[PDB]
Each structure stands twice: as C-alpha cells, then as structure tokens.
Amino acid sequence: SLGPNGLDKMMVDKDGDVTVTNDGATILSMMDVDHQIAKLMVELSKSQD
Amino acid sequence: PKAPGFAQMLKEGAKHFSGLEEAVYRNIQACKELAQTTRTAYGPNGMNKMVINHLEKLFVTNDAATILRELEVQHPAAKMIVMASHMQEQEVGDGTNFVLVFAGALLELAEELLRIGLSVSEVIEGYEIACRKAHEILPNLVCCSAKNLRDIDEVSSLLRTSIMSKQYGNEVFLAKLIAQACVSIFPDSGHFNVDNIRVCKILGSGISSSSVLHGMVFKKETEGDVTSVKDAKIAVYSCPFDGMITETKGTVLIKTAEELMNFSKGEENLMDAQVKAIADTGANVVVTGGKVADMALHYANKYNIMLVRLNSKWDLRRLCKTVGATALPRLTPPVLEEMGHCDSVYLSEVGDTQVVVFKHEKEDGAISTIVLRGSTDNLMDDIERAVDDGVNTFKVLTRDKRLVPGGGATEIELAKQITSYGETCPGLEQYAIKKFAEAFEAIPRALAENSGVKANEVISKLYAVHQEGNKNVGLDIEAEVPAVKDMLEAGILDTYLGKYWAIKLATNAAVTVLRVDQIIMAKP
C-alpha cells in the first residue's frame, strides 16, 4: 500500500459492506484482528493518522 | 436374594436410626471428628487456620467459634456442640476452644464407659454430679483478684493472656493498645459496653504501627474544606441536609408570571437563611446520613462549614455518643446545649484512603477506636477478632472479678480434686465420675500436642508437682524445657467466669448428646 506505485486494499465489513482504500489507518481499523500486537499496530496507525 | 423385608414402610425415603448403635458409635464419632477438627486450635503454641466459606471468602482464624461458623455441618449433635460453643462465645469470649475440647474429651471417655456397659442414664447422673462438684470446688482456686479499675498496667498484664493465646507474636503492642482503649472508656452508658469500642481496618504499614485514637473515625470523603478547631462545634442531623420535602406528593403550583422568579429566589434565600442560622450558633461542622442538597453545601462553603456524608444509622449513633450532642431530626434548631464539642476534626491520608478523624479529649468518657495497620486484610480480620475477644475478656473481668491460674494448672487441680471425691462416691457411678475427672487432662494434652513435646510424662510431672499444693504451677511453653512452669509469676491467668461457664456449657452439651438414643432424619 506504500508509494504512488503502491496498491490499495479492499475491506469487507461485518455487516457485508465494502470499502476500497489506501489509508493504512482505515486498513487496520476495519481489520478484525485477534492476536494482541496486531491490535497494538492498529492503534498505532490510528494514532499516527 | 435382592429382596429383604421391611416391617415398617412408614418413611417416604429418610434415615431411621435406632438401637443405641448411633449413640454408642456414630454420634460419638462425629463429636470426635469435631474434636480433631479444632484440637490444633487452642494453644499459645496453637497455630492459626484458614477456611473459605461456601461463597469463596477467606478466613484466616485461630478462634474456634469463627471457624465453626464457617463449616456448614450436617450431623445433628455436631451442630449441638457447635452452637453450644457459639453461644458460649456470645457469653464470655474465648473458651470456644475450651468448651469444644471439653466436649470431645467427655464424649470420648463416656462412650468407653457405655461400652463397658454403664447405664446411659447413670452416666448422665455421674456427669451431672461431677460437674456440680467441680463448680463447688472451683472458687477455692482463685488467685490474684485483680481489682484495679482504670490502671493500664494491671489490665495490660491481664489481657496479655487472651491476646497471647490467639496471637503469639505481638503481645506487647496489642496489650498496650487495648489497655489504652479500656482505660479511655469509663462507665458512661453502663459498665464498659463491648459495643463502645469500634474497629477500623486500614491496609499497609505493618502491625507494629497500628495505633489508637481517643475519638472515632470514618473512611469517607469531604465536601468543602478541611479544618480543625480546638473548639470544634458539631451539628448532627438524621434528616437529609435539604429543604424538608413533604412526604405527601406535593407539587408546587403557580398561577401568574412572577411566581417562577419569586419561587426560585425564595428557595435560594431560605436555604441561605437556614444554613446561616446554623452558622450563627457557631457550628463549623455538620454531619448527616441523608441526602445533601447542592445549594446547602454551596452555602456551607460560603460560611466555612464542614460536611460529612452517607453515614449509616449506627455510624451517626456512634458520632452522637462521641460528641455527646443529640442528633436533630429537625433541620432548624442548632440548639446550644445538644450541640457538638470535639477536640479536633480533620481529614488525613492513610494507605491511599481518605479518612475523617474526630481526634478528641474527653474526661467524661468517650467511645474510642483502634486503628489497625499492616499488609494483609485477612490478618486484619484475625487480629481484630482477637482484639475484640480480648475486649470481651476485659468486660467479663469487669463483670465481677477473680482471675484464675491458667496454663492448665487449674484444670489439673480440678482433676485431682474430682478424682479424690470420686473414691469417696462409691456406687457404679464411681467410674463415671472418675472418667469425668480424667477428661480434664485433655487441655494440658492439647497444649502439649500443639507444643510438640511428649505429653504423657509432662502430665505425670505436672501431677507430681501438683501433689504439693502448687496450684500456681502449670504447663510451660519451651522446647528446651518440656517440663513445667509456674503460672502465677508468668502472669498466665484467665477469668473465673469464663472457665465456670465453659464447664457448665460443655456439661450441658454432653448430657444432651448422650441422652438421645435413636434418630430420625427427613431427606434434606
């Protein structure tokens, strides 16, 4: 997802909604992680953004 | 096979017990189970115990009554002796340990006679006559009739016995603090009520730093400032500190415009007037258990008034007694005569806990409080339980008089005297009285077992030295010398009334349990 040549992600909401985006904060926010440090990185990106 | 007969189908599923088999074996076995359960309990060498309730709450304990309270028991006569000891505690304090040991010994020795075929009723007669004779001979053993009312030293030395019993490490501190408590409380509402002492638990700052205040304490916040005046004027109000709301559904009504303005303004003004009138009598501190109006506390801040909150009925009763000022259900009249008077009141920090202090000096008498400090709250439970048992001990002392020589010595004299009366009894009950006399060796036995020295020759030497009238000499507590100690010089005493009552209750429990022969048990 990094760089102008980069490629973005598309997320599937719990309720079946979709979202295409490149903003890493959103990428991790919409993610449903379970391993804790994944959550820590998600919160990392949210804070940085 | 597979099909014996029943001549009585009377029961829908239940336990029928009969044939003396239960009395001869099962009931006795249950009593012995309890005896083993708390045999380790009593003793200066007795070591503490922990139990968790059915609801998973810890209970570090050395007291027998408390531990029995936490075992939900089902065999009936087990409950018999349990609640017997329980009421005994309700009467004297320590002795729960004593009475349970007595019950175990008496039951165990009685079943032996029952096996040797003595009449159950005759066993009853013998036990009763023996108990009565022991009661008769007991007063002849009193020594050191400590009489000093309000000295600290005598009472400290005395209460050392119970404190040492249920806590072996810290006799000096607890003795001095509880003695300070006792002397501080005079006869005000009648002869040193046990309820006159309050206990607070504050974790941290280990036991040595625990202290006693001649006032009384609260673990609650504050609403305005924090001040103490050497002339502190206290007002008490059972009613919530607010405008008196009618109990009836009273909806304020208006009809024209200016009603709104005037109504809000007047509410403000008359709260202001009320609190001002309170301030006019010079009262700088107010307490209540009822709800506090924000307007009221605002005005109090304007007038530099202290507020105390959320007290329960018992709490405000305590405070009433402390300052001797009458609680006022009517918010208005801060009357001069029934208005508080305290040496000092402030807020302090202990153990990250907001603490309201009523630090006091009262010649007429005040209900003081002891502050408990240390790490483990379970240790607080144990230590405060022991302190309260000691307070009960001091109260019983005050009831009449007459310390008796502890350390089993008294009980050895009982054994010798009862036996001697036994051979002058003659009749088939002679065995009953002889076994009853034998039963008292259980106490020194228990002290030995928790002491871990060879009990038998200890008892033998104790007898031998007790053949010369040395009624003051008892069981030592020392591995180097597993022999003997003279109790009187050691100051290891205890109360006449406690021993007398424990003996009588143990006798009653025994005579009750032995008496029943066949049992019936509905399904729980």
Binding site: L40, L44 | A30, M50, H54
Partner: protein
C-alpha cells in the same frame, strides 16, 4: 437401607499437614515466577489480556497480580500484600513479592523437618524487628547535610524509582516534571488534585506539564465554535447549576385561564434564563464552566457578547480548576460576587491529536497542576499513568519523610551481612533460621543480575567480600556490570519502601507458615 452420616458436605476438600504447607510454599513460588523477571533497571513488564479481550501491559507487579486473578488461597495473601505496598510506597511491590516467596523458599527445606511453625515465625519476627532497626539506624537524611536542595533528593528519588518502568530513557525529563509538579501539591498532599490526562498520539517526549488545568472533554452545542477561543487575561466563573429552560428543575403543573397569561408564562421562563445569563455577564467574567448541561441559547448569548462557555465538564476537573484559579464553585447565580471568581494568567483551547482541549494556566497561586501525557499507544496511556502514579506517590512519601537509603539492593546486602553476623551470637535453632533469613534476603541482587544476564555468583561473591569492610552502599551497577557505590551513583530510594516491604514480607511468612490445613466448600 441406612447409610453412614457424613461430617461435612459431599466433596468438602481437606488436606492437612506438611504436604499442605509445602503445597502452599510451592504456590507462592509459582506466583513469584510470574513476577520474577519484572523488576530491574533492565527489568521487565508483562502483558495480560482479560477474557473480555482488552489488552493490558504492566510493569508494576501489583497491577499484574491484580490481573492474574488468583484462585489458590495462599497466593491471595501475596497479591493482597501487593495491593498494600501499592497503596503505601510504590515499586518494589515486585520486590515485596520476591522477598516473600524467597523467605518461604529458604524456609521450606527446614519445613521438611518437622519443626513447629511457631518457632519459625518467632525467629522471623525477631529478625524483621532487628532488620528494621538496622535500616533506621543506617537511614540517611540530607537536611542535616549542606549540599542538598530541598528538591535534589526528590529529583534523584524519582530518578531511581522511574528507571524500571516503560519510560526509563526519559527519566531525566520526567523527574523534573514530577518534582516540580508535586512541589505545587502542598500542602493537601493528596493525589486527587493533579489529574492525569491520557491524550492520544504524539511522542511521549512531547508530553506536557501545565501549571493549570486542561480538559480532554467538551461538548458540541450550537455556537461553541462561534465564540472567540482566546482570552488573554480572563475571569473564571464556575457554575454548578445548569443553564436551560426548566429542563430538569422542579416538576410542576401550571394552570392559566387568560391566553395573555400563558404568553406571559412562557416569557417568564425565558426571562428566568435571561436573568441568569445577565447575572453571568454583569459579573464581568468571560469563561463559564458547568457540571450540568448548558442551554444552546445561553451559548449563543455568550458568543454574541464574546464570552466563552462550556458544559457537562466532569466534576473532578472542575474541582481542580476551582482550586487552581482560587475561585469557588457556585450554584446560586444570584449570590455571585467577584470574590468567588477565579482568575488565570491566560486561557486557551488548542488542538492536540484531533481532540479538542481547553487550556488555562499561569496562575501564580495554584496548588494543583495536570499532566498532558502524549503517547502513541493506548496501552502506553495506562502504563505511563501507572508509572507516573508510582512516581508521584513515592515522591510524596519522600517529602513527608526526609529519609533516603541506597538502591541497587545494597540495603539488602547490608542487612544480609548484619543479620548473618548477628546469627553467630544466638545459639540453637534460631541461628539456622536467621541464616536462612539472610540467604533468602540476598535475592534482590540475584534477580537484578539475572535480568541483566551476568554471573551473579561472581557479583554476589565480590559483593560480600567488598561489603564486609569497604563501605556500606556498594551494590550492583547494571551498565558497569559489577559493584559500585550506588549512593554516589545516585540510586536513591526512600527508606519507607524497603521498611514496609520487609515488614509485610515477614508477616506474610508468618501467616502462610501458620497454616496447617485447608477446607473448601462448593
């Protein structure tokens, strides 16, 4: 068909004697191992997640033990000691637990011998009393000395206590902030005054100390963005009473015949609110805070007349503010006067990490400050807050008691030497127990060096040899990986911490060893 009658409930577990006691000792050791790594300038922290999925990292052992919900009974006592020390003196709760467990560990082999526990606990009590007396003797004050600033001891105390938690490399910074802050706390000394503000984002090097009060909170009403948000030299008005059209005031039915009277009624209500607002303005203040919600219309009027306002402010921060600007909270708008009006050097409200905060500070006479705590991790918020809380409460204790001792376990080594030498004097069974006391006590440097990855045997041996004669305050130096006079190295901890630690551990051993059997009820 009769059956035997049970004694207690079915399944009432019981286990009596030496096996019971040794099981308890082992359980305490297990609890220790969950915390053993933690303390140290190179020490450690744990992460524990609840069943609810909320993560929680911690370095303070007491917090961890709180998270580790212990079921086994004996260990509950240890965790309670953790709470006690946490409420009393701070870090070393870790150390407290290690002392307790190691005391039990050294005693357990002798427990294998059938020794009556009371002898052990008597020896423990005697040893602990002697140890406390020794510490108090070798306590160090500074106000007798000449080269102490009333804060330098406090600064170095924070220096020492901090450098184990999550912010260790910013200690030279945070010590200055916390010392200067606590210096303002006088003389109420209670923690509730200085709040902690866990602002999201930012590097914690950017975390802010304000000589005033700030809010992580606000709430949007109509005009809240309209009014000017600078007030250079403002007057603070503090209202507890709400400002809204009889929203939640006294409940009343009203009856009105004449239509014109009904008009007058609605007019009079709005005249109530206008009267309150006029009282507010004519007060001359410009900033109004309220616990209770604020009417939008009043916000509009403040905007038109260039007053700032805010509603629903949490009560604790309001108390902070009123204690800061000296004003007194008001509930009656009518009784207002300039006396109860707080004043501040300057007022502001500036963005930090997307959140809308409020600022007012510079009040020369303000006994309460607050920490804006930047940090990129939500978990940092709790952990840094815990570390800061430890720092604040320990420095408070230090101000209360001008007593300091060396760190780095040197105290423990000195006690070990002193107690071992004393043990020679008392013959018999007591001697071995005293020896075991010392051998357990020496653990602190061992764990330090192990978390440092050194040969703590060489360190310990050199420690004992040098510490027999050469100086009191020699102890472990992490970076030089060997002994140093940590006192001159400024590893300074309040005596109270170690004193309370030893006392608590002693009575913990007493309690645990004073148990023979356990009863369980379903």
């Amino acid at each position: 068909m009769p059956t035997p009658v049970i004694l207690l409930k079915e399944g009432t577990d019981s286990s009596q004697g030496i096996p019971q006691l040794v099981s308890n000792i082992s359980a305490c050791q297990v609890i220790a191992e969950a915390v053993r790594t933690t303390l140290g300038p190179r020490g450690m922290d744990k992460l524990i997640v609840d069943g609810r999925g909320k993560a929680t990292i911690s370095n303070d052992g007491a917090t961890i033990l709180k998270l580790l919900d212990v079921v086994h009974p004996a260990a509950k006592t240890l965790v309670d000691i953790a709470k006690s020390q946490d409420a009393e003196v701070g870090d070393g709760t870790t150390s407290v637990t290690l002392l307790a467990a190691e005391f039990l560990k050294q005693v357990k082999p002798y427990v294998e011998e059938g020794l009556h526990p009371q002898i052990i606990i008597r020896a423990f009590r005697t040893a602990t009393q002697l140890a406390v007396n020794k510490i108090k003797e070798i306590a160090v004050t500074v106000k007798k000395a000449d080269k102490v600033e009333q804060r330098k001891l406090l600064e170095k105390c924070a220096m020492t206590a901090l450098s184990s938690k999550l912010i260790s490399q910013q200690k030279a910074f945070f010590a200055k902030m916390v010392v200067d802050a606590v210096m303002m706390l006088d003389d109420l000394l209670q923690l509730k005054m200085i709040g902690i503000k866990k602002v999201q984002g930012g590097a914690l090097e950017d975390s802010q100390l304000v000589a005033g009060v700030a809010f992580k909170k606000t709430f949007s009403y109509a005009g809240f963005e309209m009014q000017p948000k600078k007030y250079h030299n403002p007057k603070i008005a503090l209202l507890n009473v709400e400002l809204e059209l009889k929203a939640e005031k006294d409940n009343a039915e009203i009856r009105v015949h004449t239509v014109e009277d009904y008009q007058a009624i609605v007019d009079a209500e709005w005249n109530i609110l206008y009267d309150k607002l006029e009282k507010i303005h004519h007060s001359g203040a410009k900033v109004v805070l309220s616990k209770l919600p604020i009417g939008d219309v009043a916000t509009q009027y403040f905007a038109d007349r260039d007053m700032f306002c805010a509603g629903r402010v949490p009560e604790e921060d309001l108390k902070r503010t009123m204690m800061a600007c000296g004003g007194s909270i008001q509930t009656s708008v009518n009784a207002l006067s300039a006396d109860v009006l707080g004043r501040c050097q300057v007022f502001e409200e500036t963005q930090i990490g997307g959140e809308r905060y409020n600022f007012f500070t510079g009040c020369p006479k303000a006994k309460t400050c607050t920490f804006i705590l930047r940090g990129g991790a939500e978990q940092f918020m709790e952990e840094t807050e815990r570390s800061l809380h430890d720092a604040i409460m320990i420095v408070r204790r230090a101000i209360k008691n001008d007593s300091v001792v060396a760190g780095g376990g040197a105290i423990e080594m000195e006690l070990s030497k002193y107690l071992r030498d004393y043990s020679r004097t008392i013959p018999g069974k007591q001697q071995l127990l005293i020896g075991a006391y010392a051998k357990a006590l020496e653990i602190i440097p061992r764990q330090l060096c192990d978390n440092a990855g050194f040969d703590a045997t060489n360190i310990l041996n050199k420690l004992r040899a040098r510490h027999a004669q050469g100086g009191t305050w020699y102890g472990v130096d992490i970076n030089n990986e060997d002994i140093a006079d940590n006192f001159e190295a400024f590893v300074w901890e309040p005596a109270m911490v170690r004193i309370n630690a030893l006392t608590a551990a002693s009575e913990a051993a007493c309690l645990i060893v004073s148990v023979d059997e356990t009863i369980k009820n379903p």
